[PDB]
Structure formats: structure tokens, C-alpha cells
Design a protein around this ligand. Sequence first.
Ligand SMILES: [Mg+2]
Ligand SMILES: [Mg+2]
Ligand SMILES: [Mg+2]
Ligand SMILES: [Mg+2]
Ligand SMILES: [Mg+2]
Ligand SMILES: [Mg+2]
Ligand SMILES: [Mg+2]
Ligand SMILES: [Mg+2]
Ligand SMILES: [Mg+2]
Ligand SMILES: [Mg+2]
Ligand SMILES: [Mg+2]
Ligand SMILES: [Mg+2]
Ligand SMILES: [Mg+2]
Ligand SMILES: [Mg+2]
Ligand SMILES: [Mg+2]
Ligand SMILES: [Mg+2]
Ligand SMILES: [Mg+2]
Ligand SMILES: [Mg+2]
Ligand SMILES: [Mg+2]
Ligand SMILES: [Mg+2]
Ligand SMILES: [Mg+2]
Ligand SMILES: [Mg+2]
Ligand SMILES: [Mg+2]
Ligand SMILES: [Mg+2]
Ligand SMILES: [Mg+2]
Ligand SMILES: [Mg+2]
Ligand SMILES: [Mg+2]
Ligand SMILES: [Mg+2]
Ligand SMILES: [Mg+2]
Ligand SMILES: [Mg+2]
Ligand SMILES: [Mg+2]
Ligand SMILES: [Mg+2]
Ligand SMILES: [Mg+2]
Ligand SMILES: [Mg+2]
Ligand SMILES: [Mg+2]
Ligand SMILES: [Mg+2]
Ligand SMILES: [Mg+2]
Ligand SMILES: [Mg+2]
Ligand SMILES: [Mg+2]
Ligand SMILES: [Mg+2]
Ligand SMILES: [Mg+2]
Ligand SMILES: [Mg+2]
Ligand SMILES: [Mg+2]
Ligand SMILES: [Mg+2]
Ligand SMILES: [Mg+2]
Ligand SMILES: [Mg+2]
Ligand SMILES: [Mg+2]
Ligand SMILES: [Mg+2]
Ligand SMILES: [Mg+2]
Ligand SMILES: [Mg+2]
Ligand SMILES: [Mg+2]
Ligand SMILES: [Mg+2]
Ligand SMILES: [Mg+2]
Ligand SMILES: [Mg+2]
Ligand SMILES: [Mg+2]
Ligand SMILES: [Mg+2]
Ligand SMILES: [Mg+2]
Ligand SMILES: [Mg+2]
Ligand SMILES: [Mg+2]
Ligand SMILES: [Mg+2]
Ligand SMILES: [Mg+2]
Lengths: 146, 204, 118, 65
Amino acid sequence: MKLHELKPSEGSRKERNRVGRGTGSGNGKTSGRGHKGQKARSGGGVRLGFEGGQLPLFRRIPKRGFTNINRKEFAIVNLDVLNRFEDGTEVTPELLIETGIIRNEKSGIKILSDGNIEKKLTVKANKFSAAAKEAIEAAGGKTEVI
Amino acid sequence: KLSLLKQDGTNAGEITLNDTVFGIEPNEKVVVDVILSQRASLRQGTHKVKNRSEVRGGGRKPWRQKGTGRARQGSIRSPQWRGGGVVFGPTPRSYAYKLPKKVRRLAIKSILSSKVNEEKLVVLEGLTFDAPKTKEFAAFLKNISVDTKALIVVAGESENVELSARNLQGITVIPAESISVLEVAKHDKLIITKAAVEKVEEVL
Amino acid sequence: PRVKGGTVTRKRRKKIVKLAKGYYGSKHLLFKVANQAVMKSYQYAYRDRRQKKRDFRRLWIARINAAARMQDLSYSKLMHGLKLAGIDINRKMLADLAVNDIASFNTLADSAKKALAK
Amino acid sequence: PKMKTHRGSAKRFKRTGSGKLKRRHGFTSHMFANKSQKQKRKLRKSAMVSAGDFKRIRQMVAKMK
RNA sequence: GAAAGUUAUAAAUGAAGCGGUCUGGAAAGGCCCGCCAAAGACGGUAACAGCCCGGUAGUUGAAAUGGCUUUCCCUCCAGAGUGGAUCCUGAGUACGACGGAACACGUGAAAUUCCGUCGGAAUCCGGGAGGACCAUCUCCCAAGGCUAAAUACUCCCUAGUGACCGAUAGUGAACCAGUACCGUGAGGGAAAGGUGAAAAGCACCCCGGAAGGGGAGUGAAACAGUUCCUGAAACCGUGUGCCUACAAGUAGUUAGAGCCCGUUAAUGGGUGAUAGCGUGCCUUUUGUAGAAUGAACCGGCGAGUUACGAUUUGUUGCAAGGUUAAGCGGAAAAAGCGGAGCCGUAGCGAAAGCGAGUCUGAAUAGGGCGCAUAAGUAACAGGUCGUAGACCCGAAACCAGGUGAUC
RNA sequence: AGGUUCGUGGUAGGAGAGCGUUCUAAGGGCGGUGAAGUCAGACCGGAAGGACUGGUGGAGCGCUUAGAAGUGAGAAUGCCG
Ligand SMILES: [Mg+2]
Ligand SMILES: [Mg+2]
Ligand SMILES: [Mg+2]
Ligand SMILES: [Mg+2]
Ligand SMILES: [Mg+2]
Ligand SMILES: [Mg+2]
Ligand SMILES: [Mg+2]
Ligand SMILES: [Mg+2]
Ligand SMILES: [Mg+2]
Ligand SMILES: [Mg+2]
Ligand SMILES: [Mg+2]
Ligand SMILES: [Mg+2]
Ligand SMILES: [Mg+2]
Ligand SMILES: [Mg+2]
Ligand SMILES: [Mg+2]
Ligand SMILES: [Mg+2]
Ligand SMILES: [Mg+2]
Ligand SMILES: [Mg+2]
Ligand SMILES: [Mg+2]
Ligand SMILES: [Mg+2]
Ligand SMILES: [Mg+2]
Ligand SMILES: [Mg+2]
Ligand SMILES: [Mg+2]
Ligand SMILES: [Mg+2]
Ligand SMILES: [Mg+2]
Ligand SMILES: [Mg+2]
Ligand SMILES: [Mg+2]
Ligand SMILES: [Mg+2]
Ligand SMILES: [Mg+2]
Ligand SMILES: [Mg+2]
Ligand SMILES: [Mg+2]
Ligand SMILES: [Mg+2]
Ligand SMILES: [Mg+2]
Ligand SMILES: [Mg+2]
Ligand SMILES: [Mg+2]
Ligand SMILES: [Mg+2]
Ligand SMILES: [Mg+2]
Ligand SMILES: [Mg+2]
Ligand SMILES: [Mg+2]
Ligand SMILES: [Mg+2]
Ligand SMILES: [Mg+2]
Ligand SMILES: [Mg+2]
Ligand SMILES: [Mg+2]
Ligand SMILES: [Mg+2]
Ligand SMILES: [Mg+2]
Ligand SMILES: [Mg+2]
Ligand SMILES: [Mg+2]
Ligand SMILES: [Mg+2]
Ligand SMILES: [Mg+2]
Ligand SMILES: [Mg+2]
Ligand SMILES: [Mg+2]
Ligand SMILES: [Mg+2]
Ligand SMILES: [Mg+2]
Ligand SMILES: [Mg+2]
Ligand SMILES: [Mg+2]
Ligand SMILES: [Mg+2]
Ligand SMILES: [Mg+2]
Ligand SMILES: [Mg+2]
Ligand SMILES: [Mg+2]
Ligand SMILES: [Mg+2]
Ligand SMILES: [Mg+2]
């Protein structure tokens, strides 16, 4: 394009609004703030959760639970994704990482059982759900745990 | 595709260019956005004004609060005073921003193909000079009928082209890796050496 | 970049001060009172632009009444007779006939008398 | 500076699978002789933060309760 | 302590139009011809200069002193194994009680470090830590010391840059500025730029004591004459076309005769005897012409902004994927490299955990939250919010360091 | 782009389309045969506003498309003259 006829995409840029420039624009004297309150003052307003003295909602309901230091989370792989592999292939967590369908392993690879598979495959992973194992041996493959 | 020609003006044969680079349908909106992005990151943004807390003086209340007949005043450097401080004004600040990589690659492809779509691109087999001489370069430019702002892309040898063309006004020489959207858009014609074409194609 | 306010304020104020030409005292010299004078003049013109039609209709009716009283008719009777006969001449043209061509006015009054009695 | 998460309400609410907030009932501490068994059974479950309160406390739990 | 090199502090050389013609006070400008260019940066010259001047690119240059780098000189120097009998390995310390402090950690289940007061070890078959503590295991040797680089800042110096200001702006200070002035003192703290290209800064004559004028002269211009480019408004005057001394006036608007003119030429301009209608502007209020508030008039200055996060709408690129951060590279560039990380693709439960389900529950019951019923991510722009003075002006007061008994 | 029908008082407030000012980039321009500024006119547009002619002035300034803001004053017992 020529620099003397630049035209940005329509709808992608808009004009800023300026308040306090005369009464003809609708944002003149009071500048969209009303008349003589706390919210009409410079730097005015109350805290995010303030209710004017009434007890805040979070302070009239109880706390619950604790946090486990040894919490374990697993990367989830479903069966339908696993269909993208030529059968007779030994599927390995390192292979799952190299193909790019698993970005980071959190505490191990655990496969689930939604969707369908139809390929004879051998799969090894840290954990298996019951139905996922049943579906894998249903198609003829074998499951082994790492 | 295009017609390769020698630097003396005589035809040198034929040259073909990759269609994934020079043959795509240009995306104008992406080019405009990238041009704005590249132009907005060239500015220093060195500017500054003094608030009422940096103007020398102040502190003492000019006169009493009540009973004197004058208006209530609190400092000699208040914004409404004559020598007072600025309210908001400018401040040192950066303006640079950068947009996703694939967008920038699409932009360079589109603007580089748009030149070919308008017959504003010249490919020549070689371009060399024994010694730096602006007269020879001017004669060259006259021979290949450019007569306008031009950008010359030389790849590896070039002998001494930058020196022998540094004084001409609307002429710029870049080493085939510094190619940019804004630089290409700034100049009218684009003269590119054959050896630079392979480099440009293989990079993108 | 700094944008100092020159040449724009005076250009705008001088237009109002020129619009207030011919007023008494400072109303044609000083911006603050000239602005109020100009706004009030615009408002007065807007209102009088409606009252003008009312005033002229009153004048036409008075002249028609005066001319018709010389023919042993009221304004009310004359207008009723003209409406009953089927004549659609407005007050302006009847007043014109009354002021100048009174013969034609008397002919129209004869038509109204004919229709009214009938 | 990035805005801070309200720690007091980060111990009481939970973010569900649709983005809503889940809370606990609040009359269940020390006067169980004064309320019936139906009321106690229904107070031991969990409720949801209503629309009016959600409109007021979005910003203050904006990052994962 | 030498030798060599380099660098900093003066400098030298350096291409090309007196080109013709028009306007003009003056050519660097217009028109028509040429030339140089590793030099078309900047400034000056009677208006806008690559070819008039100082210069610029490039190439050279140092008697003297300082800095850096190599080489020589000079100076100083033990490091491997094989054995364990015996000896050594930081004492009023390490810890403990009491009272405080620092650790993101407010005495708490309180580990770790430091201070004041008392008590007070082992020492290789030994000692400490792994967030009270004991056993097992693992890692490590306190109570002695030194150590460059990657990091923070700029009163200064050399070379530069700016979608920074342009005399109420920008430093308080573009000018003999921390000066004049104010105060006992600490301390506070201004106003004030421009003749002309060149003084060619008005010889001489007339009025006057002078100041100041009228001619004459210089000048492109004196209506540029020693606050001197331009010269607005308030404010003060001189002359004249229309009206005005029986008239109750927010001063105008509508109708309108008479008199005087003649335009960006069109159902034009100035003034207006007489008639109808008509209680300024702003703020704050249920309600203001208000006898409620503000403004003597004119001019200049004077109030929603930026940085980082959240959320929502629009646009663009890719799409079950999207995207890099710091950093390397470079011209205060553009690519290229960098996948550490972040969001999304799975939820439920306080948790172990299970998983298109899960939790409650004795339950294959019912119910809650989810799936069926699946589009996100990166950047930009608008709206709003949070942390920062956060929209601008205004207290009485509080604390800390100092100056004052010349009243 | 052309029609039919229904509408077009308005404070706080919501939404939309625009005028003008300073600077930057590209294209194209005018100016000692007189630029910006200033003064006067009975011209043009729906508004903010924009031209043309003449006097003073004596050297710089518009236009088109985008971008960035120290962005427009009649009031604050507002500050300076
Ligand atoms: Mg707008
Ligand atoms: Mg409004
Ligand atoms: Mg107002
Ligand atoms: Mg108010
Ligand atoms: Mg309010
Ligand atoms: Mg201060
Ligand atoms: Mg103070
Ligand atoms: Mg200042
Ligand atoms: Mg400026
Ligand atoms: Mg102003
Ligand atoms: Mg009059
Ligand atoms: Mg959870
Ligand atoms: Mg309990
Ligand atoms: Mg020389
Ligand atoms: Mg020379
Ligand atoms: Mg001449
Ligand atoms: Mg010439
Ligand atoms: Mg000269
Ligand atoms: Mg001149
Ligand atoms: Mg000059
Ligand atoms: Mg030791
Ligand atoms: Mg210890
Ligand atoms: Mg203790
Ligand atoms: Mg041990
Ligand atoms: Mg540890
Ligand atoms: Mg432990
Ligand atoms: Mg040691
Ligand atoms: Mg000035
Ligand atoms: Mg100043
Ligand atoms: Mg003194
Ligand atoms: Mg001078
Ligand atoms: Mg004299
Ligand atoms: Mg004289
Ligand atoms: Mg004379
Ligand atoms: Mg003369
Ligand atoms: Mg001059
Ligand atoms: Mg003067
Ligand atoms: Mg005047
Ligand atoms: Mg009488
Ligand atoms: Mg009389
Ligand atoms: Mg009257
Ligand atoms: Mg009242
Ligand atoms: Mg009164
Ligand atoms: Mg009051
Ligand atoms: Mg008053
Ligand atoms: Mg999208
Ligand atoms: Mg990547
Ligand atoms: Mg269920
Ligand atoms: Mg705000
Ligand atoms: Mg003393
Ligand atoms: Mg309306
Ligand atoms: Mg209506
Ligand atoms: Mg709005
Ligand atoms: Mg001319
Ligand atoms: Mg002439
Ligand atoms: Mg200007
Ligand atoms: Mg003029
Ligand atoms: Mg304009
Ligand atoms: Mg302003
Ligand atoms: Mg004023
Ligand atoms: Mg005053």
C-alpha cells in the first residue's frame, strides 16, 4: 500500500470520549457524575465489597476445607485423540510429548474413556481408568502400567 | 515469471520466483496494521513536565484562611497560579508494541507481492563496482529507467554499492536480510539482485 | 505536543460582538453582555415569528369589520354569509378589496346578503 | 501492579464448571438446640452466590477464588 | 623500570557555476543550460545555496603530558602415593530459661537468624540440618578472614537524538538571579527577549530655556528614530449621516413612515418618529426576575491523564490449539534464534481419590455441581473498575530537624 | 438506491455522527508579482464552522489520507497584566 492512502480496517479503531468540554456533547458541567455525593468527588467511591456498614457477604458465611501439600494432578488423554496413530504402535509418554498432544506432564499421564477407538495399539501410561482399559482390550490392544 | 536483465540494460534471460512469496493475494489490513506498529516504535518519547510537587518553592500558605477578603489559597505553585505546576501533561513513556509473528510474515509477503502485481519490481543478475563512484551509479540508475525513489537489495558481494550510492537522495541499499515492511512501503520501486532473491525466498 | 490557545478564541468572540452591533452602550462592545443580548434577541425573534401571523390576522379582521359596517352588516354576519354561499376568499384579500377596490367588496357583500337571507 | 486477590473470600467460595461461585450456608455454628432437624438438614448443604452479590464481588475473586 | 603499539588533549589538506536572463533594496528564488559527489550534515552570507564562506566524506598529523594493551625486566614459589597406633580440626561458644527483634510468618503446633541477663556441652566411638519433637535415612563440618564480573546512581566531560517548550511556556533564573525586595534570624523570593542587511543613529534651517515638534537628508521602509518586528480588546478622544427636551425604558424583537446611502447584487445597507410583546447569565433548589450565591471590564493561563492488572464489545492472524518472557543478534532498526512459562482441550470432592462422571448417603434411591448441548488464544482500539495524589482548588490540625529573650 | 407507515419538548443520564487547534509520515502544492498574523465587508454550509476581495504586515504556510495529544473557557470571593 502507499503511505499517502493508508486506511485501517473499519470498526477496528474508535474515537476517545472526552468529558467536560461544553454542554453540547452531553458530558459537560458535571461530566457524567451526577450531583453532590461521595461518588461525585475526586478519588471518591468505596471499597470493592463495601455495603455501607452492613456486614459483607463473605463475613457471614463460614470457611471450609484445607489444602493438601501432596496433591497430585495428572495430564488427561482421551480415547478419540488416541485414534490418530497407526496401529501396532507402542504408545509412550515420551512419544505423546514428542507428537505435541501433551505439552507438560504434571504428575503422570492418565487416559480416560470418552470417545471411541478401533485400532490395535499397545499403550503404557502412569494410570488408567477402568473403562479406558476395558475399551483398549475391547479393540484387541494391550495395556501396561509404567 | 519475470525477466532477468543485466546492469547495462540488456536482457539477461528469464527468472522465476516462488509463488508462495511473490504470488499470494495481498492482505491490505494486515499491512496497514504492521506499518502503524513499525512506525510507532521508532519514536523516542522523551518529554516531561513538572507537577506542583516538583516546581521550586511552595509549602508556605500565602495568607490566612479567613478574614482577609481574598480567595482561599494554599500554595504559590498551585495549577491555577501563573508560575504553578502542570496538572497532567506529558511524561516519559515508551510507544513500542509488537504483534504476532505469523501476522508480520503475512504482511511482508503481501507487501512484497504487491510490488510484482504492479510491475514495480526489477530483478537483475548482478551489480558490482570496481571503485566507489556516484557518477557511475547515477548513470546506472538512468540506464534502468527508474527516475523515482528506489530501494536496492544486494545479497553477498555487491563490491561497494552502499558507498557509491550513499549520496543520492531517494536511494537506499539494504543487505537482503534487513528487508522490512516499512522500508519497502517507503520507496516506490524495488531493484533486487538475483542473488538476493534466493536469500529472501529461503528465509520466508 | 503543547497546543497553545491562539487565534481561535478571538475569532469566535468577535463574531458575537459583531452580531450585537447597534445595541446601547456596552451591549455592542463587551463580549459577556453581547452574548446575552444575542441569545435574547434570537429567542425574541423566534417568538415574534409566531406572533406576527396573529397580529396581521387581527388587523385584517378589524379592517374587514370596519368596511362591512358601512353596508349594514357585521363582520360576523358577513363571514357567515360568505361561508354559506361558498366563497373561499381569505381575510387578507378581503381586506385588500376593502382598502382599495371597495366596489368589488360591495359586490361580495351583496352576494353574502343574498345567501344569508335566501 | 497486578491487583490482589481478596484472601478472606478465597477461603469461602468455589468456582464451578460454568464460571459461577459456590458457597456454604451460614447458620451452623453453636445454637443447634434452637432450630429444628429439617432446618439443620437443609443448612448442611451448599448454595450458590446470587446474581446481585455476584455483580458486586466479581473483581475481588477474579483469579481462581 | 624499560620497549613497542594505540588512544585523549591543538591542527593540515580537501571536488564542483563570479553561467545567461526576469522581478527585486539585495538572489540563495522563477526560466534555460552545465558540473562534482566515499563530499546532497550543519551554520553564515542583503529572501529558500551540493558548486560564495566556515566546513563535510576521505586521507594525514604530536614537541609535551595523561590513559590502556602486549613484550622484556623484576619478584616469588614444592606436589603425588602408601599406612592409622598416637595427636590436631575455632569454649564461657553451641545450645537452654526469661524479655525483645528480623525472617512473607502478629507466639502461634513455630523450625531458622540476632540482641540483653543468667545457666551451660561433646569434641571423629564426634557434631549440625532436612519448619515442634523421637527413631531410620540423606546431605553437610559452625563458633577466623579475603575475593574481580554480571547490579544501582550522574555534580561533571566529549559526540549526538527527540511525532519536548518557545518568553504568563521551558529551570526560580534565555537579560550582571538566588540578584532587587521582605525578615532580628532560620528563611521566602520576583519583573525584565526582538531598530535595521549595514548606524548609514536624522548635517543644516525654523518655534522653545529645554523637552518636543515641522521641513531637509540616510534608508527598501522613519506610520522602522535608542521597550525601536507585528500592534488585538478594554479604556481615552476629534469630525460627521440619522434620531432626541410631555417622556415611566433587562434596553431588545415584530409591524413601520421619513431621511441618508449604493453591496461578495439580493425579495440590499444606516438611523429610526409611532404601535404590539417582553422581569439578565451561572450555581443550588419542591420552587429563583429574585430582596439567595458569583462575576468592575478586557487579554493570557486554568480541571478525567499516564503506568501496571481485571472484565466486556469491535477488528485481525492462527485454530484443538494459541503464544512467547528474560536474553543472543543488530543501526535507540527488521528478521532469525530462544518453548522456561501462561491460557485452553474435564469435572466432582474439605481430602485420600475417582473420572463423563463425581459428592452426599447403607442405597442400583433421590438430589447438588458437570457431560451430553465443545472454541480458544495473541495483539490492537473503545467503555468501566482496582493500586498509585487519580478530576481541579480549599482546612482547622499532627509529627521531625532547626531559628528566635534587640519586643 | 427508491418507496409505505409511524414519529422528531426535554433536566440527571445512555448511544451515534462530526467541526476546529498543535505536531508527525507520504503525496501534491503557493509564496518578495507579497506567507502567517491583524482590520473591514451586504458571501457559503443543518451546527460546530469555511471561503473571496481590499488595507496594514514583511517571511513563511496550506491541501488530501492516516497517526499522536499539554484539545476548544464566561463564571472557581480563580492567578498575572
Ligand atoms: Mg466521539
Ligand atoms: Mg444530558
Ligand atoms: Mg458550564
Ligand atoms: Mg455542584
Ligand atoms: Mg450521586
Ligand atoms: Mg514543593
Ligand atoms: Mg508543609
Ligand atoms: Mg515553570
Ligand atoms: Mg510548538
Ligand atoms: Mg484560553
Ligand atoms: Mg437602533
Ligand atoms: Mg477444585
Ligand atoms: Mg461445627
Ligand atoms: Mg581547506
Ligand atoms: Mg574547495
Ligand atoms: Mg532590476
Ligand atoms: Mg539564480
Ligand atoms: Mg554570500
Ligand atoms: Mg525579508
Ligand atoms: Mg535567512
Ligand atoms: Mg571450623
Ligand atoms: Mg540450632
Ligand atoms: Mg524467646
Ligand atoms: Mg548423626
Ligand atoms: Mg529444605
Ligand atoms: Mg521434618
Ligand atoms: Mg569457615
Ligand atoms: Mg511575544
Ligand atoms: Mg519564565
Ligand atoms: Mg536586611
Ligand atoms: Mg536586531
Ligand atoms: Mg532637537
Ligand atoms: Mg526633527
Ligand atoms: Mg521628513
Ligand atoms: Mg528616498
Ligand atoms: Mg525582519
Ligand atoms: Mg512598535
Ligand atoms: Mg484599538
Ligand atoms: Mg400631559
Ligand atoms: Mg417631543
Ligand atoms: Mg417598542
Ligand atoms: Mg428552601
Ligand atoms: Mg435589585
Ligand atoms: Mg454558598
Ligand atoms: Mg459580589
Ligand atoms: Mg478471533
Ligand atoms: Mg514455539
Ligand atoms: Mg447425579
Ligand atoms: Mg479515574
Ligand atoms: Mg538562642
Ligand atoms: Mg429530542
Ligand atoms: Mg412534538
Ligand atoms: Mg456517552
Ligand atoms: Mg503572484
Ligand atoms: Mg513589482
Ligand atoms: Mg503555525
Ligand atoms: Mg492579509
Ligand atoms: Mg479546514
Ligand atoms: Mg487546556
Ligand atoms: Mg476573566
Ligand atoms: Mg487585577
